[PDB]
Amino acid sequence: HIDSVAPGDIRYEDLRRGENLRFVGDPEEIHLVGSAAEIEQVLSRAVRSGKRVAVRSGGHCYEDFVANSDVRVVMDMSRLSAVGFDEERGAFAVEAGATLGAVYKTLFRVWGVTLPGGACPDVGAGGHILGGGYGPLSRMHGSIVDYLHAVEVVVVDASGDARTVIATREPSDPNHDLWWAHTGGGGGNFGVVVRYWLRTAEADVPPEPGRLLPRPPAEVLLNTTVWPWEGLDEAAFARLVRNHGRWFEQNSGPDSPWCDLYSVLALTRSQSGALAMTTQLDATGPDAEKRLETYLAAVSEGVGVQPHSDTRRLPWLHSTRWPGIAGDGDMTGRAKIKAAYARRSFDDRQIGTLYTRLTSTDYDNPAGVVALIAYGGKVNAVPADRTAVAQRDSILKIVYVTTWEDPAQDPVHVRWIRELYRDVYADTGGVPVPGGAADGAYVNYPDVDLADEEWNTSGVPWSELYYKDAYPRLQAVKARWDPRNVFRHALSVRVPPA
Amino acid sequence: MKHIDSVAPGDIRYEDLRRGENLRFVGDPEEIHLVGSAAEIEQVLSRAVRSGKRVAVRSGGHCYEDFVANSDVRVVMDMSRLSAVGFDEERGAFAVEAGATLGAVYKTLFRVWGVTLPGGACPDVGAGGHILGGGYGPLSRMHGSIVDYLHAVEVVVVDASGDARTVIATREPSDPNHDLWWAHTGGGGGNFGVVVRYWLRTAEADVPPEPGRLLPRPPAEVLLNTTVWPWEGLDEAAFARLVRNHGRWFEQNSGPDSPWCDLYSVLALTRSQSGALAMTTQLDATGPDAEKRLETYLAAVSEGVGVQPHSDTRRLPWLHSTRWPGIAGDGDMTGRAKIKAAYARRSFDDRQIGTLYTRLTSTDYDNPAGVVALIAYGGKVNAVPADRTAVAQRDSILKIVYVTTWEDPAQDPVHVRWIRELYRDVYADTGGVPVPGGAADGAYVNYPDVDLADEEWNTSGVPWSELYYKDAYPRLQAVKARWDPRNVFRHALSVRVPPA
Numbered sequence: 001h002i003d004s005v006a007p008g009d010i011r012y013e014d015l016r017r018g019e020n021l022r023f024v025g026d027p028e029e030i031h032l033v034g035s036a037a038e039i040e041q042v043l044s045r046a047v048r049s050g051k052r053v054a055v056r057s058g059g060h061c062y063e064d065f066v067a068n069s070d071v072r073v074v075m076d077m078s079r080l081s082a083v084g085f086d087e088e089r090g091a092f093a094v095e096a097g098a099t100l101g102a103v104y105k106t107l108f109r110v111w112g113v114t115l116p117g118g119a120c121p122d123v124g125a126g127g128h129i130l131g132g133g134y135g136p137l138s139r140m141h142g143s144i145v146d147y148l149h150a151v152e153v154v155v156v157d158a159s160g161d162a163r164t165v166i167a168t169r170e171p172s173d174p175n176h177d178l179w180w181a182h183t184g185g186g187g188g189n190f191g192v193v194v195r196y197w198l199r200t201a202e203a204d205v206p207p208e209p210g211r212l213l214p215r216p217p218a219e220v221l222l223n224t225t226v227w228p229w230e231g232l233d234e235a236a237f238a239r240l241v242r243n244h245g246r247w248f249e250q251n252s253g254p255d256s257p258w259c260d261l262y263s264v265l266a267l268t269r270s271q272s273g274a275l276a277m278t279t280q281l282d283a284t285g286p287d288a289e290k291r292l293e294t295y296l297a298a299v300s301e302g303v304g305v306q307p308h309s310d311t312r313r314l315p316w317l318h319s320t321r322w323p324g325i326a327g328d329g330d331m332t333g334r335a336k337i338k339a340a341y342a343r344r345s346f347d348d349r350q351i352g353t354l355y356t357r358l359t360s361t362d363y364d365n366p367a368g369v370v371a372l373i374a375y376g377g378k379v380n381a382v383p384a385d386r387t388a389v390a391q392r393d394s395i396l397k398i399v400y401v402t403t404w405e406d407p408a409q410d411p412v413h414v415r416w417i418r419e420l421y422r423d424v425y426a427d428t429g430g431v432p433v434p435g436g437a438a439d440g441a442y443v444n445y446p447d448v449d450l451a452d453e454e455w456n457t458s459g460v461p462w463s464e465l466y467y468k469d470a471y472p473r474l475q476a477v478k479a480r481w482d483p484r485n486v487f488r489h490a491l492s493v494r495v496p497p498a
Numbered sequence: 499m500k501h502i503d504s505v506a507p508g509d510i511r512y513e514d515l516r517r518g519e520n521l522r523f524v525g526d527p528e529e530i531h532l533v534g535s536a537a538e539i540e541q542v543l544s545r546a547v548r549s550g551k552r553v554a555v556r557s558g559g560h561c562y563e564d565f566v567a568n569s570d571v572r573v574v575m576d577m578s579r580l581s582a583v584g585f586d587e588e589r590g591a592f593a594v595e596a597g598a599t600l601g602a603v604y605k606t607l608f609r610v611w612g613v614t615l616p617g618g619a620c621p622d623v624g625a626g627g628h629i630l631g632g633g634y635g636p637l638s639r640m641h642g643s644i645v646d647y648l649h650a651v652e653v654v655v656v657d658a659s660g661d662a663r664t665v666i667a668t669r670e671p672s673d674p675n676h677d678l679w680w681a682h683t684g685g686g687g688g689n690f691g692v693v694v695r696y697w698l699r700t701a702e703a704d705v706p707p708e709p710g711r712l713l714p715r716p717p718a719e720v721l722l723n724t725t726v727w728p729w730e731g732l733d734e735a736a737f738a739r740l741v742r743n744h745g746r747w748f749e750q751n752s753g754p755d756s757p758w759c760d761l762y763s764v765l766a767l768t769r770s771q772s773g774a775l776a777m778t779t780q781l782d783a784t785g786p787d788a789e790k791r792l793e794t795y796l797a798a799v800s801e802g803v804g805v806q807p808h809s810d811t812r813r814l815p816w817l818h819s820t821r822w823p824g825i826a827g828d829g830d831m832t833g834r835a836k837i838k839a840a841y842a843r844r845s846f847d848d849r850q851i852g853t854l855y856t857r858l859t860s861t862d863y864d865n866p867a868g869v870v871a872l873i874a875y876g877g878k879v880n881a882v883p884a885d886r887t888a889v890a891q892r893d894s895i896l897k898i899v900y901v902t903t904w905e906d907p908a909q910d911p912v913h914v915r916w917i918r919e920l921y922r923d924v925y926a927d928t929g930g931v932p933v934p935g936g937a938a939d940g941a942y943v944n945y946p947d948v949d950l951a952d953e954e955w956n957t958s959g960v961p962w963s964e965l966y967y968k969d970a971y972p973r974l975q976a977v978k979a980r981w982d983p984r985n986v987f988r989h990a991l992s993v994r995v996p997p998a
């Protein structure tokens with residue numbers, strides 16, 4: 001229970017931002033909240049005053065949802081970073097301010113378990129878990145939301161009063177639909193998550209903590225494969241994308257033996273000098289090294305460029321902080337990200353578009369990338385309607401990103417990535433319309449352009465791209481638990497016009 | 499704060515937990531205990547002492563030598579559960595548990611109280627093995643050594659009877675355990691007992707008992723510069739002028755009263771195979787002429803060198819700046835490395851600069867990853883008398899790191915020999931080591947190098963102990979005799995009592 005941070009405080013330049021430096025907030029106060037009770041009193045005071053609020057956990061939002069200049073009061077979750085096992089509830093409690101790196105280190109070193117969350121260690125649990133997401137173990141263990149047993153959330157009723165509710169996976173729980181909205185609803189929509197409780201949904205299980213969350217593979221093979229751009233012509237490039245697409249089309253079923261494989265294929269600007277792929281395979285099973293080889297051979301088969309390939313073997317927890325998996329921890333640039341689900345691999349026109357845009361000399365930036373992220377496996381064993389992650393038959397997530405340094409150049413980079421993504425999706429109004437080759441987009445990589453009639457000409461609204469048929473049930477949760485629409489932003493769940 | 503099962507061979511965690519972060523060393527411990535409390539640590543030590551089993555503690559795992567992962571160690575106490583950071587109102591000081599990483603310490607101290615500690619720049623280093631060894635970081639020149647803030651330490655020690663007990667030792671001179679406190683202001687890890695938690699606060703007398711005033715404030719915003727000089731067409735005279743410019747600058751601008759106490763930089767003298775020499779610089783941005791002052795430093799380093807540097811400067815809020823890889827490093831501990839270290843009281847002489855040029859351009863070696871890094875130091879570190887803590891080096895201007903990195907264990911001999919011969923040749927005038935009290939001032943124990951205790955590599959007649967501790971060593975030996983009389987806590991560079 002401590003002083004809030006206001007302009008003039010030594011901490012204000014840090015705390016008025018998240019990790020995305022494109023967005024600089026102007027809040028009057030940032031509250032380092034310490035408990036559900038404190039969050040109730042901050043929210044109720046702000047609601048009484050008519051002041052716009054937002055929550056910051058890990059600060060990784062790709063859009064201006066927290067740092068929007070309209071936000072007056074931020075609740076920053078940094079003090080709430082506990083991770084542990086709640087004996088009373090029989091589940092792991094992860095408070096919203098815990099980073100994923102701290103979650104994986106504690107769960108694994110202490111109990112030998114993990115969650116199939118994201119790969120960046122500094123991401124906050126608070127804005128990540130409730131939006132679903134992907135990570136290296138999604139194929140092996142399913143989505144992180146498949147582990148959400150309960151959620152503690154501070155909500156604001158019609159009167160303006162704040163209160164804390166615990167909502168659970170039990171369907172007769174009066175707050176069951178509020179728990180369901182936290183299985184992929186996304187941050188900044190329903191209320192302030194204080195903590196999540198995570199546990200397997202299996203009925204079998206003795207209630208010992210080491211049995212109650214999935215085990216990672218004990219060691220993994222990690223490969224870095226790099227093809228020089230100087231050696232790749234369009235036909236080569238196309239063959240490689242096609243090989244990879246076919247392989248993921250064949251080998252992403254929930255019963256596939258390849259659920260233990262994860263990879264990221266980085267289709268980089270040719271200006272970068274090299275195309276690259278990072279692969280992780282469980283190293284513990286019979287024939288791991290040969291199986292890794294047979295995946296790598298498939299990707300490069302008939303490409304006519306010999307890739308540079310190196311494989312190391314690491315114990316699992318050490319593996320998670322290898323930069324090839326974790327990324328480089330550099331958030332000091334400016335970036336614009338876009339995203340899509342792929343149900344099938346890129347077609348011939350799309351591959352040609354990608355080739356053109358990545359080799360273009362009308363643009364100058366080595367940092368543009370289209371990353372194809374191995375997906376499906378056990379994520380796809382879950383029926384589409386079970387959680388608020390409705391996309392349960394995709395084979396890849398696709399990330400489109402460009403990064404740069406100079407803010408005067410924002411319009412150039414933002415236009416390039418917008419035109420690239422619009423042209424890849426040109427047959428469907430510039431966007432990855434669901435239930436076809438694509439399956440919409442995923443809310444942890446929000447893109448306000450999906451709501452912009454200038455860029456989305458498909459007639460399919462942003463809410464259907466992220467949530468497909470889950471959206472009506474999410475709107476009902478919104479109407480019931482945030483009737484005043486306290487929690488909102490450029491892509492927030494909104495009730496139907498009245 | 500309950501005990502849980504220990505981790506033995508067969509356990510899914512054993513491959514991770516038998517290692518620290520330096521992959522050259524793989525422990526063969528029988529048991530790794532994820533200790534939850536001091537009482538638990540007492541039980542594990544007691545048991546190990548009775549059965550004659552060798553112990554070591556692992557906090558953040560960043561040890562550069564085999565002190566924890568030595569195949570002789572049978573029982574490891576792993577501090578991962580003890581990672582709290584907070585303000586302890588019982589003592590009026592900030593408590594940092596041994597298992598907390600520096601990243602977590604800086605994020606908590608600064609977001610919650612607006613304060614910090616002038617410790618190391620790598621966020622994943624653990625408090626446990628770091629703070630008691632002293633060390634350096636970006637704010638050393640501004641705020642002095644992290645040990646200058648050590649108020650008290652909770653440590654589990656083993657008596658001659660082999661009973662284990664927990665003691666709190668403080669900076670209070672009348673404390674019966676004062677000497678044990680002192681040995682934790684630089685005596686280094688793995689020597690006296692198991693640190694459970696440290697308490698930190700300013701020693702200032704005229705300070706109100708509020709947390710936000712009890713530790714130093716960082717500069718609210720900093721300028722951060724990357725400068726790069728291409729190696730192609732940088733000849734020996736050019737290299738030499740660069741190293742000499744930088745050296746003279748630090749000779750003149752590293753006193754405790756210097757206005758340049760708010761500057762930190764690291765100059766990386768890289769292998770020419772790498773393609774570029776590089777320098778990273780941080781400067782407080784909040785004062786009137788910060789841009790211009792930064793340019794003055796950069797212009798001094800490049801003056802008359804004749805190779806135009808590529809230079810880019812960004813400005814960040816302080817906490818964000820700490821995670822910029824230019825300052826924090828790259829977070830990649832997956833390779834193999836051998837490191838060596840020295841204090842510099844003066845900058846490199848002409849002979850040493852020539853040896854550096856030869857070694858870094860050599861085509862008899864093949865590795866672009868060799869570096870000699872020159873780290874800005876002194877400033878407010880040198881305001882403290884040499885005898886006040888167990889960090890005896892209080893008049894140096896630079897710390898120097900010699901490092902080589904590689905991948906294949908089959909090549910260990912080759913990289914190890916390269917860095918040994920480089921270091922020996924730079925220090926050839928004094929027995930291949932940085933002998934204290936001269937152009938050098940010994941080495942610092944957070945970058946331990948067991949070759950300093952090897953008569954094959956150290957031909958100066960000055961022992962490893964004097965290189966690390968100078969005249970603090972006798973008082974360290976008294977503390978060792980008093981609090982670890984059985985010599986439970988030991989390794990290749992551990993404090994040892996005199997021969998009997």
Ligand SMILES: *Cc1cc2c(nc3c(=O)[nH]c(=O)nc-3n2C[C@H](O)[C@H](O)[C@H](O)COP(=O)(O)OP(=O)(O)OC[C@H]2O[C@@H](n3cnc4c(N)ncnc43)[C@H](O)[C@@H]2O)c(*)c1C
Pocket residue numbers: 018019054055056057058059060061062065066077096117118119120122123124125126127128131132133134135186187188189191192193194327444445489
């Ligand atoms: C920067 C970054 C993001 C990544 C990275 N890797 C990912 C990966 O491997 N898989 C993924 O699925 N996602 C990855 N992401 C994206 C992140 O998952 C998203 O950026 C998350 O939304 C980030 O969460 P968090 O760090 O907490 O960011 P915030 O900016 O604080 O919040 C985002 C959003 O959610 C709301 N919110 C925060 N906290 C709460 C609580 N407690 N209750 C309700 N709502 C909350 C915010 O207000 C905002 O709306 C890798 C990298 C490097």
Ligand SMILES: *Cc1cc2c(nc3c(=O)[nH]c(=O)nc-3n2C[C@H](O)[C@H](O)[C@H](O)COP(=O)(O)OP(=O)(O)OC[C@H]2O[C@@H](n3cnc4c(N)ncnc43)[C@H](O)[C@@H]2O)c(*)c1C
Pocket residue numbers: 518519554555556557558559560561562565566577596617618619620622623624625626627628631632633634635686687688689691692693694827944945989
């Ligand atoms: C890998 C790494 C090391 C760095 C980095 N950056 C540094 C910097 O910017 N400034 C520095 O001064 N030092 C830097 N270092 C070096 C680290 O400071 C040292 O490597 C520290 O000794 C690391 O401490 P820790 O991570 O806790 O390492 P451990 O291997 O667990 O222990 C080292 C040593 O100390 C003993 N020990 C650990 N814990 C205890 C306790 N609780 N009580 C007593 N003794 C303890 C161990 O047994 C071992 O002997 C940047 C990078 C990337």
Ligand SMILES: [Cl-]
Pocket residue numbers: 034035036037194
């Ligand atoms: Cl609470």
Ligand SMILES: [Cl-]
Pocket residue numbers: 120121122123326327329
């Ligand atoms: Cl990260």
Ligand SMILES: [Mg+2]
Pocket residue numbers: 019122329331821
């Ligand atoms: Mg970060």
Ligand SMILES: [Mg+2]
Pocket residue numbers: 321519622829831
């Ligand atoms: Mg690390």
